[PDB]
Design a protein around this nucleic acid. Structure first.
Ligand SMILES: [Ca+2]
Ligand SMILES: [Ca+2]
Ligand SMILES: [Ca+2]
Length: 292
DNA sequence: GGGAATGGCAGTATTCATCCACAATG
DNA sequence: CCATTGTGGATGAATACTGCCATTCC
């Protein structure tokens, strides 16, 4: 119904989007499909409808029982996508996929995808995108087709990008701290953003960008990702809450953030060190995030 | 006529979000 | 002792990404 700010959109797409190139055999026996996909939980369908209304393109289809996808594949409508990301460009390593997506779009625009020479170029493009070439494409186009591509290294452009990106990757936690001495718990606010190590430079930059926090790496067990993490309450209350109050979040995570700010006000006013304050904080923790 | 383009999903794989422990710190 | 803060553990599902048959269009 409502349209999303374009820089929030790009932030959310850096978080949740996918740029795809699919090349399939007919058994001109290769057709090629170029596609932008956002797949979210059903609860955030309105995000997709809001992107769909901001672009005036794309279809929305259910994606199994619990998810839903916005899909742009119609060739003419991809110009809308490309226009958007030229004015408001991605900054994660996904930017490399979008560039390859754009390069493939030129091949198809010049009607070259249908010719043998075009297919071979599109195969080279697809090898560098996302998870690379399928086994069938590898059987049909043998050899070691290069997967290498330039590393993206861009800085956060503004807080509206951050807001869109955090709407996708962020976590606003109310955490109860247990101790050895007794059964009484304390409360801690946690802000986190997770991301694959491939964007280690962007993640590191959040420390200076937001003026607080840490990066932690987790390697459980042969997977690797990074955690931007903030727990110190003054940093939460003075540095994190203002940013996202000025730069509004989208989706259901907006509600979790608002419940988060409620707890933070209770902590700000020392109401959390009272049995009634803590009781209410517990109630909130139960009905947000995974409890919502 | 027919096959390319597009719709409409369901399926696969993993990168996230999320709740959590407990040591450290003052 | 209490309260806060640091440093991740662990888990599984909401993501990212892919696959395929049906319908539309040229
Ligand atoms: Ca992501
Ligand atoms: Ca998300
Ligand atoms: Ca995500």
């Amino acid at each position: 119904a409502s349209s999303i700010n374009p820089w929030i959109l790009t932030g959310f797409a850096d978080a949740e989007g996918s740029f795809g190139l699919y090349i399939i055999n007919r058994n001109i026996r290769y057709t090629t499909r170029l596609k932008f996909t956002i797949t979210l939980h059903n609860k955030d369908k309105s995000i997709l409808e809001n992107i769909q209304s901001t672009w005036k393109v794309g279809i929305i289809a259910n994606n199994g029982d619990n998810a839903v996808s916005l899909i742009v594949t119609r060739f003419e409508d991809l110009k809308v996508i490309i226009d958007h990301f030229e004015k408001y460009p991605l900054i994660t390593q996904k930017l490399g996929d979008y560039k390859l997506f754009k390069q493939a779009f030129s091949v198809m625009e010049n009607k070259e995808h249908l010719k043998e020479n075009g297919i071979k170029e599109l195969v080279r493009i697809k090898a560098k995108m996302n998870w690379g070439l399928t086994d069938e494409l590898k059987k049909a186009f043998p050899g070691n087709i290069s997967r290498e591509r330039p590393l993206i290294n861009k800085n956060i452009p503004n807080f509206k990008w951050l807001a869109g990106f955090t709407s996708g990757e962020g976590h606003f936690g109310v955490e109860l701290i247990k101790n050895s001495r007794n059964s009484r718990v304390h409360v801690r606010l946690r802000f986190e953003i997770a991301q694959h190590v491939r964007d280690k430079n962007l993640m590191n930059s959040l420390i200076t960008y937001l003026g607080c926090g840490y990066i932690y790496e987790q390697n459980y067990s042969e997977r690797s990702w990074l955690r931007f993490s903030v727990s110190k309450f003054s940093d939460i209350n003075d540095k994190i809450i203002p940013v996202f109050q000025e730069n509004t979040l989208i989706g259901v995570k907006l509600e979790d953030f608002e419940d988060w700010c409620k707890v933070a006000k209770l902590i700000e006013e020392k109401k959390h060190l009272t049995e009634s304050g803590l009781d209410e904080i517990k109630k909130i923790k139960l009905n947000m995030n995974k409890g919502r």
